[PDB]
mmCIF file of C-alpha atoms in Angstrom:
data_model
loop_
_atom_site.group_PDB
_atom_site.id
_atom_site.type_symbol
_atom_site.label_atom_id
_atom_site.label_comp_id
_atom_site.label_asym_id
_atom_site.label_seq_id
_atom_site.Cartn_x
_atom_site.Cartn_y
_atom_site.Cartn_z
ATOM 1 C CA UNK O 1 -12.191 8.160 -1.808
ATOM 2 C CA UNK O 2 -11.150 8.605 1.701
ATOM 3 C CA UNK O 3 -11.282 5.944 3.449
ATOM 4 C CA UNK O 4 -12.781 6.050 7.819
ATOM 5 C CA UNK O 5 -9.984 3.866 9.824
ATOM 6 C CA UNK O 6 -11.758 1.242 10.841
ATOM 7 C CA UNK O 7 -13.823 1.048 7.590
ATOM 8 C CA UNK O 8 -10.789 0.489 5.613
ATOM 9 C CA UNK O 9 -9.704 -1.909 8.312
ATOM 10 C CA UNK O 10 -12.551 -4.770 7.589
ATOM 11 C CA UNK O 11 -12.155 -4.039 4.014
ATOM 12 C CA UNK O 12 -8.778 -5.372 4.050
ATOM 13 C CA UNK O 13 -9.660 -7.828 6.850
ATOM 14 C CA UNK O 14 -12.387 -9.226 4.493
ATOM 15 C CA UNK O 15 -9.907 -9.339 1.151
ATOM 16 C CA UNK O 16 -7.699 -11.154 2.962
ATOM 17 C CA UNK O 17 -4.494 -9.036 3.728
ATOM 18 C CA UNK O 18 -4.555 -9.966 7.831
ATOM 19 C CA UNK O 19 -2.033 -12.351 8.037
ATOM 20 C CA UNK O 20 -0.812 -12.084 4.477
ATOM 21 C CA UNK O 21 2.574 -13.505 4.220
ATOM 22 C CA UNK O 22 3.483 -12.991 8.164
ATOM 23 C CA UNK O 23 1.747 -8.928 7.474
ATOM 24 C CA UNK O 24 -0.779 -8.076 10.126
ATOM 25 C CA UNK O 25 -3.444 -6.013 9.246
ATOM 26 C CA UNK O 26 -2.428 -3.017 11.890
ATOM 27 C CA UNK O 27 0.736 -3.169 9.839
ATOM 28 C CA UNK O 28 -0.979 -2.838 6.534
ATOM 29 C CA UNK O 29 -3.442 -0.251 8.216
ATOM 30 C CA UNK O 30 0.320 1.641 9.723
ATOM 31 C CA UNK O 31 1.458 1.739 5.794
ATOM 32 C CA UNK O 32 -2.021 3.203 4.351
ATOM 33 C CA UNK O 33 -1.932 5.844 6.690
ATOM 34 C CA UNK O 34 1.434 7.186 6.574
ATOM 35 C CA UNK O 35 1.742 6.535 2.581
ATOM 36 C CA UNK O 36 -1.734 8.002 1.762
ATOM 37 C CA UNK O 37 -3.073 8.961 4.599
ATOM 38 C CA UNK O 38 -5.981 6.311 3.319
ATOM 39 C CA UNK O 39 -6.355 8.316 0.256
ATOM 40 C CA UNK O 40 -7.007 6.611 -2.695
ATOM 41 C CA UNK O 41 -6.446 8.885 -5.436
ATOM 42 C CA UNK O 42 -3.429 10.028 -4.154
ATOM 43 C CA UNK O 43 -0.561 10.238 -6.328
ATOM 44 C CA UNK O 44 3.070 11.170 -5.634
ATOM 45 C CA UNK O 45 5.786 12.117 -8.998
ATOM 46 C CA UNK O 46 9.265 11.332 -8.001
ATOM 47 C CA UNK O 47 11.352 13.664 -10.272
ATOM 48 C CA UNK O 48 14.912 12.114 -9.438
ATOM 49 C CA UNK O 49 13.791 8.798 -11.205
ATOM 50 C CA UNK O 50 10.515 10.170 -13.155
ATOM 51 C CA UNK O 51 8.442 7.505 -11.315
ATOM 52 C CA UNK O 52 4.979 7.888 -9.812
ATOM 53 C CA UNK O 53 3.296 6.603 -6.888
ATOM 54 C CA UNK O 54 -0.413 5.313 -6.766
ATOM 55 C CA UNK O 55 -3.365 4.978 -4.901
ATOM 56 C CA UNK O 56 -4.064 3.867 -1.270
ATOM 57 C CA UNK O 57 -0.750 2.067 -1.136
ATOM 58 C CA UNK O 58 1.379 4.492 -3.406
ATOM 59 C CA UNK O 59 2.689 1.459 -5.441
ATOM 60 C CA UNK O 60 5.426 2.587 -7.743
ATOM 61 C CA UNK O 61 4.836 2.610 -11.643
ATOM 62 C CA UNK O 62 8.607 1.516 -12.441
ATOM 63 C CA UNK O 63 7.697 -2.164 -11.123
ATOM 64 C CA UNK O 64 4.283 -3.043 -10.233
ATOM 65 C CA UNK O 65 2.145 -1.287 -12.335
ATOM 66 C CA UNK O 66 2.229 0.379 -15.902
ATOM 67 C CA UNK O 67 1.467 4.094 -16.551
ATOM 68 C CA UNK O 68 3.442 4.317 -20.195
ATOM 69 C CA UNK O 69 5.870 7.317 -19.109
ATOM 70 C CA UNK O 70 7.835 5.576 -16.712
ATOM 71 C CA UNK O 71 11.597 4.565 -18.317
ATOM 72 C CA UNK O 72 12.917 1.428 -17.366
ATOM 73 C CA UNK O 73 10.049 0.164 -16.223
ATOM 74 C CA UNK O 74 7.991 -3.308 -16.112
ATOM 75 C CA UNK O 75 4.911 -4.286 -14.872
ATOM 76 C CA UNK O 76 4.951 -7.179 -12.116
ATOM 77 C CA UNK O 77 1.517 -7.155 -11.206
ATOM 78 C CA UNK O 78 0.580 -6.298 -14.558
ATOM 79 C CA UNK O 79 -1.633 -3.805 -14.231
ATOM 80 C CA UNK O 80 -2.788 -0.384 -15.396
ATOM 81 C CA UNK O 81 -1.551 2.135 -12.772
ATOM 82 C CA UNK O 82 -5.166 3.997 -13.417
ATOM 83 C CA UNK O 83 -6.745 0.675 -11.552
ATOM 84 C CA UNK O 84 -4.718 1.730 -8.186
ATOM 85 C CA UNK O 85 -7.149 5.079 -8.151
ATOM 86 C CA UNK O 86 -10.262 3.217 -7.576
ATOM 87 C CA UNK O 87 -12.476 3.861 -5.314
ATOM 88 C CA UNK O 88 -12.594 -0.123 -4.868
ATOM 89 C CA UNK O 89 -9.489 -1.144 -3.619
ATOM 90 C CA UNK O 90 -9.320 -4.930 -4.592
ATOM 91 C CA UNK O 91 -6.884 -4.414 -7.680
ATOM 92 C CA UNK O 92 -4.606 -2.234 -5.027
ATOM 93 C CA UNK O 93 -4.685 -5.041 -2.712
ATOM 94 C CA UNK O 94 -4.006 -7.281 -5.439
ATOM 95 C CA UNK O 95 -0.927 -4.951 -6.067
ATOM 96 C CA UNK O 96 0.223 -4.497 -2.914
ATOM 97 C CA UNK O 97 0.100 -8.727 -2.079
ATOM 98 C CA UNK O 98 2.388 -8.914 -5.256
ATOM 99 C CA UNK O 99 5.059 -6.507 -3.885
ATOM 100 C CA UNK O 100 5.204 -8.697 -0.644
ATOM 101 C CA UNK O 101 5.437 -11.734 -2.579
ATOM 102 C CA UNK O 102 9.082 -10.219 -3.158
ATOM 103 C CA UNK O 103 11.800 -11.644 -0.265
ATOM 104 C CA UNK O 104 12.167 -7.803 1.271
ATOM 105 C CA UNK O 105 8.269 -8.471 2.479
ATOM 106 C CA UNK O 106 6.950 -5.299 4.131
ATOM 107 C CA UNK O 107 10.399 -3.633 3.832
ATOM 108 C CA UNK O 108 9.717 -2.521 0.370
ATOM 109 C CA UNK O 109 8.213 0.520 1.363
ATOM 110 C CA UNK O 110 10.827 2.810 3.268
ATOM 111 C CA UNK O 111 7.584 4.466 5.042
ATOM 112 C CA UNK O 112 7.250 1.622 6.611
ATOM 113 C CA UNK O 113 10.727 0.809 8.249
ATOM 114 C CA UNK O 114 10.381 5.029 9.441
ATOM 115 C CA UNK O 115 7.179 4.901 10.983
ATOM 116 C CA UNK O 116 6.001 1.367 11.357
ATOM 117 C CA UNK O 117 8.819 -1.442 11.939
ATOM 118 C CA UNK O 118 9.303 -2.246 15.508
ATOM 119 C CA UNK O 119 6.440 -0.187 16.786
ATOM 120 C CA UNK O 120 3.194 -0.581 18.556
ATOM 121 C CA UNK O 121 1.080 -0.532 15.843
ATOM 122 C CA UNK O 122 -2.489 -1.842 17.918
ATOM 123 C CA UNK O 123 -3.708 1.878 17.267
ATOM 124 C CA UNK O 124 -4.283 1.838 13.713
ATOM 125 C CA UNK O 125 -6.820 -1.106 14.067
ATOM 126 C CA UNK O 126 -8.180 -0.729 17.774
ATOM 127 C CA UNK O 127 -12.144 -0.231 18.384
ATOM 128 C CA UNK O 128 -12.400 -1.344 14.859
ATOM 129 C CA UNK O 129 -13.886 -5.451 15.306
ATOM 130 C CA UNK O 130 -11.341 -6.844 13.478
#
């Protein structure tokens, strides 16, 4: 599924993400759109480390979730990477809370200190009635 802006907006509005551990939602809405472009079957294989990323949030299979190919890898949120290409996002945003829970916060994801971090980010969730 490909998600309208300000539809995925109140999604994550209504699971609970604006405000999530100091994370506004226009920041979560900045990271969806430059990781996946609010795509959430899209994957991404990084060949250096034989990783993947997946789903809305491209959360990486050597921590967070477990696809069975990835070497050195663990599963902190404990789930099956196939769950982060749902058309329901609620096990992503489960995910993707997880990751933050971790003391580099937003940070995690490099996308978002590129394109994001110290921005004005009002765009991603303006006209949306969140």
């Amino acid at each position: 599924k490909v998600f309208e802006r300000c539809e995925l907006a109140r999604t994550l509005k209504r699971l609970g993400m604006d405000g999530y551990r100091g994370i506004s939602l226009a920041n979560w809405m900045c990271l969806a759109k430059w990781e996946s472009g609010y795509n959430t079957r899209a994957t991404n294989y990084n060949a250096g480390d034989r990783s993947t990323d997946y789903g809305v949030f491209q959360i990486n299979s050597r921590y967070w979730c477990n696809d069975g190919k990835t070497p050195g890898a663990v599963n902190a949120a404990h789930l099956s990477c196939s769950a982060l290409l749902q058309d329901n996002i609620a096990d992503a945003v489960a995910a993707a809370k997880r990751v933050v829970r971790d003391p580099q916060g937003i940070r995690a994801w490099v996308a978002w200190r590129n394109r994001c971090q110290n921005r004005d980010v009002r765009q991603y969730v303006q006209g949306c009635g969140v």
